[PDB]
Amino acid sequence: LVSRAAIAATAMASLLLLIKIFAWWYTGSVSILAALVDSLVDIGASLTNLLVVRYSLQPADDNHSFGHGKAESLAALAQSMFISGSALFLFLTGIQHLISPTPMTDPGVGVIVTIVALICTIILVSFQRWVVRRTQSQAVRADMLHYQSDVMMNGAILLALGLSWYGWHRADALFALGIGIYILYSALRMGYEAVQSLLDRALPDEERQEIIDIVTSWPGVSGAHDLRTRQSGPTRFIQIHLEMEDSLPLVQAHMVADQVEQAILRRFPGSDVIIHQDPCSVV
Amino acid sequence: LVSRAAIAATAMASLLLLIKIFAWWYTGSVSILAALVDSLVDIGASLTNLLVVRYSLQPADDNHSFGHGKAESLAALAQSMFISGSALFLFLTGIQHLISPTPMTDPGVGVIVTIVALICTIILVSFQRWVVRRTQSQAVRADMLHYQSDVMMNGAILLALGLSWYGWHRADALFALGIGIYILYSALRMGYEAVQSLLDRALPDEERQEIIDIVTSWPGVSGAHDLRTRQSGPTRFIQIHLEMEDSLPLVQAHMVADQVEQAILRRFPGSDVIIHQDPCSVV
Ligand SMILES: [Hg+2]
Ligand SMILES: [Hg+2]
Ligand SMILES: [Hg+2]
Ligand SMILES: [Hg+2]
Ligand SMILES: [Zn+2]
Ligand SMILES: [Zn+2]
Ligand SMILES: [Zn+2]
Ligand SMILES: [Zn+2]
Ligand SMILES: [Zn+2]
Ligand SMILES: [Zn+2]
Ligand SMILES: [Zn+2]
Ligand SMILES: [Zn+2]
């Protein structure tokens, strides 16, 4: 078990595609296609992304007294718009050459690029999927989503069965349109979750209940009333009002409260809680 | 003195430009220019903006246990990108027809549109400026910025002095480029403040000091230690640890803490504070 610098590591893993920009060729073979710029965009985009996460990981600042966490959700929302753009672009291209011009990508150009493209993008996407699973990173999930579209690469266009015996036409249209609807949807949902962490949305009901249970069960407390929750990137923010006994000394009240705090802090490691203690002046 | 529904009001004041879409003409005079679509975009854009602020104004939710405030800063950041786009578009157009083609907007077409355009946009921008001043609205400031670019309308192109006596050329280039640099800068700064409220950035040093003064001055408190601050839209979030005397009854400690809270609350109305009280277990 390493730490959230696991996400730091994926960010360069995106810059693995640095070798893919070199696994392009002009001096090796004087021929040019378009997927040398998509992967030049990638270097920039996901290099920015590395910088943004590196900002995201900084601890409490002078003028960021809470996290820098949100940087991730911004970075997400940024990417989700750009990925949501490329996907409408490719869905409208899906109905565009629904053989309105014609299946034109016929040049059997050295497809050893697009098969290698798959193979090293496949490699990335899974390392990415591994970190997404290990650490819930908003930021890396978005950067993955794009590469998940790049994995939608078609050196899987039929050449023997090919198109289809004329009358019932076939081209990229069915696939290039299909990916478009799914990835638009996928980026759209992705973004919606980003803005939703940017609004200070509450924790999942599950986590919320755990907190309620931890608290109400506890020896010292009698009631607990105001419970607000949110997370910025990894770290989650929890506040609550605990209702201890009116006549308790403060040092004692603070003890029960410190414990309840300390409990919540074991259960959601990384978290930041703050307990207001009330006596009995609540109906 | 009305309330933050003052911003609600500007949102329709943007939809005042609904009459400007009708103050266009095809059936009155069969002639067409481009500034009928810029103001059709306006209806949509700033209508969305009205909805987003109206969302922004909702009180504490089930799954937004803090504000909906941030909606504004999102809405800002949204607009700042789109306004930051139109401004690079117009700066690159500024060096584009630096008489590379030629001063082509020669048709003395019924400019009674662009003068009226000024006059009712001028009207808006000032009502907008009035609310921006009255209520610091992130959201309305952005929506204003665009109209501030629309106020940069040139029925102030010289026709008598005109261009200039040939050898020392003159066109829109000097103005259309000039606006471009300023508004790009203006939208870029605008956005940066948006993301900066989206990161949970601290209150201005001034406001932060007022809180420190309010607290440390207070009778009951001995020290105060952890102070975190931020605002989402209008409402500002404040938390602090107060150090009361170890042996105090809770009901008493809560009283001093309640007053300190109540003080901060008078000084920054709308605010939301939360006080953790500690005894003496701090060095
Ligand atoms: Hg590889
Ligand atoms: Hg009690
Ligand atoms: Hg008007
Ligand atoms: Hg003390
Ligand atoms: Zn790519
Ligand atoms: Zn900082
Ligand atoms: Zn309470
Ligand atoms: Zn209280
Ligand atoms: Zn406009
Ligand atoms: Zn809500
Ligand atoms: Zn403390
Ligand atoms: Zn404490």
Chain A nearest-CA distance from B162, in A, is: 43
CB contact under 8 A, B66 and A251: no
Give, rounded to a whole angstrom, the gap between the first and last alpha carbons of chain B.
47
**What CA–CA distances, in Å, run from B60 to A16, A241, A247, B65, B99?**
45, 17, 32, 5, 56
Name residues whose C-beta falls within 8 Å of residue A218's C-beta, 6 or more positions apart in sequence: A256, A259, A260, A263
Q: Which residue of B has its CA nearest to A195?
A: B74
Taking the CA of residue B265 and the nearest CA in chain A, the distance in Å comes to 16
**Three-state SS at B138:** helix
**Taking the CB of residue A139, how many other CB atoms lie within 10 A of it?**
29
The annotation status of A146 as a binding-site residue, yes or no, is yes
Q: Which two tokens stand for residue B280?
A: 């003496």
Cβ count near B172 (within 10 Å) = 19
Nearest CA in chain A to B246: A251
CB atoms B253 and A250 under 8 Å: yes
Query: Please, where are the H alpha helices in A97-222?
Result: 112-134, 138-151, 173-198, 205-217
Give kind and range of the element (H or E) at residue A72: helix A71-96
Return the closest-CA partner of residue B118 out of B157, B88, B163.
B157
Instruction: Name the residue in chain B with its Cα closest to that of A273.
Output: B276
CA distance A229 to B62: 11
| CA gap A78, A81 in Å, rounded | 6
Chain B residues with CB within 8 Å of chain A CB: 62-68, 70-71, 74, 195, 198-202, 227-230, 232, 239, 244-251, 253-254, 274-279, 281
Contact state of A279 with B62 under an 8 Å Cβ cutoff: no
> Tokens 């590395």 label which residue?
A50
Q: Find all residues with CB under 8 Å of A256, minimum gap 6, and list them.
A: A218, A219, A220, A221, A242, A244
C-alpha–C-alpha distance, residues B209 and A163, integer Å: 72
User: Which residue, among B244, B255, B261, B241, has the nearest Cα to A281 in the 3D structure?
Assistant: B255
| Residue of A66, A227, A250 lying closest to B244 (CB–CB) | A250
Hunting for tokens 């609807």 — which residue is that?
Answer: A181
Residues facing residue A223 across a β-bridge: A243
Instruction: Report d(CA B245, CA B11) in Å as an integer.
Output: 51
Provide, as residue numbers in chain B, all residues whose Cβ is less than 8 Å from the Cβ of A253.
Answer: 250, 253
Residue B141 and residue B134 in contact, taking contact as beta carbons nearer than 8 Å: no
Domains of chain A: 1-199 (1.20.1510.10), 200-283 (3.30.70.1350)
Contacts of B64 in chain A (CB under 8 A): 199-202
Question: Does A38 show up as a binding residue in the annotation?
Answer: yes
> Which residues of chain A are within 8 Å of residue B63 when distances are taken between CB atoms?
201-202
Long-range contacts of A111-119 (CB under 8 A, 24+ apart): A111/A155, A113/A23, A113/A24, A113/A25, A113/A33, A113/A35, A114/A35, A114/A153, A114/A154, A114/A155, A115/A155, A116/A20, A116/A23, A117/A20, A117/A23, A117/A35, A117/A39, A117/A150, A117/A153, A118/A151, A118/A153, A118/A155
| Pick from A146, A182, A143: nearest CA to A38 | A146
Which two tokens mark B123?
A: 């009207």
Residues paired with residue B78 on neighbouring β-strands, in sequence order: none
CA of B122 to the centre of ligand 3 (A): 9
Enter the DSSP assignment of B203: P
Token pair listed for A113? 């690029």
**Cα-Cα end-to-end distance for chain A:** 47
∠ CA B136-B142-B148 to the nearest 5 degrees?
Answer: 110
Instruction: Report resolution in angstroms.
Output: 2.9
Q: Please choose, from the candidates B167, B248, B155, B257, the residue with its C-alpha nearest in 3D space to the C-alpha of residue B215.
A: B257
Q: How many Cβ contacts (< 8 angstroms) between chains A and B?
A: 108
Are A10 and A141 in contact, with CB atoms under 8 Å apart? no
**Cα gap B278→B283, rounded to integer Å:** 12
CB-based contacts of B81, cutoff 8 Å, min separation 6: B187, B191
Q: How many CB atoms lie within 10 A of CB B211?
A: 23
Verify whether the Cβ–Cβ distance A71 to B251 is below 8 Å. Answer: no
Of the partner residues A199, A244, A251, the one whose CB lies closest to the CB of residue B68? A199
Contact A7, A135 (CB under 8 A): yes
Q: Mutual orientation of helices A173-198 and A71-96 as an angle, nearest 10°?
A: 160
Interface contact flag, B64 A202, Cβ < 8 Å: yes
CB contact set of B118 (below 8 Å; sequence gap of 6+)? B151, B153, B155
**In the numeric block, which tokens belong to residue B48?**
């969305």
Is residue B213 marked as binding? no
Question: Can you tell me the distance from the alpha carbon of A158 to that of B53, in angstroms, rounded to the nearest whole number?
Answer: 51
What three-state secondary structure class fits A224? strand
Query: What value, to the nearest 5°, has the Cα angle with vertex A36 and ends A30 and A37?
Result: 130
Cα separation, A197 vs A231, in Å, equals 7
CB-closest option in A67, A249, A278 to B254:
A278
CB contact under 8 A, B247 and A244: no
Please state whether beta strands A272-278 and A235-243 pair in parallel, antiparallel, or not at all (unpaired). Answer: parallel
Are A85 and A191 spatial neighbours (Cβ–Cβ below 8 Å)? no
Question: Which ranges of B15-137 would DSSP assign to H, the alpha helix?
Answer: 17-22, 38-56, 71-96, 112-134
Q: Give the whole-angstrom CA distance, residue A222 versus residue A279.
A: 9
Residue to test with chain B: of A58, A73, A74, A199, most B Cβ within 10 A: A199
Nearest alpha-carbon partner for A190 in A271, A120, A85, A35: A85
Does B202 contact A68 at a Cβ distance shorter than 8 Å? Answer: no
Cα distance between residue A251 and residue B279, in whole Å = 6
Q: How far is the CA of B45 from the centre of ligand 9 (A)?
A: 10
Distance of CA B73 to the CA centre of its chain: 8
Residues composing chain A: 283
Reported for A148-151, long-range contacts at CB under 8 A and 24+ positions apart, including other chains, are A148/A183, A148/A186, A149/A83, A149/A86, A149/A87, A149/A179, A149/A183, A150/A38, A150/A42, A150/A117, A150/A121, A151/A118, A151/A121, A151/A122, A151/A125
What gap in Å lies between CA A194 and CA A139, rounded to an integer?
A: 9
CB B74: neighbour CB atoms within 10 A?
23
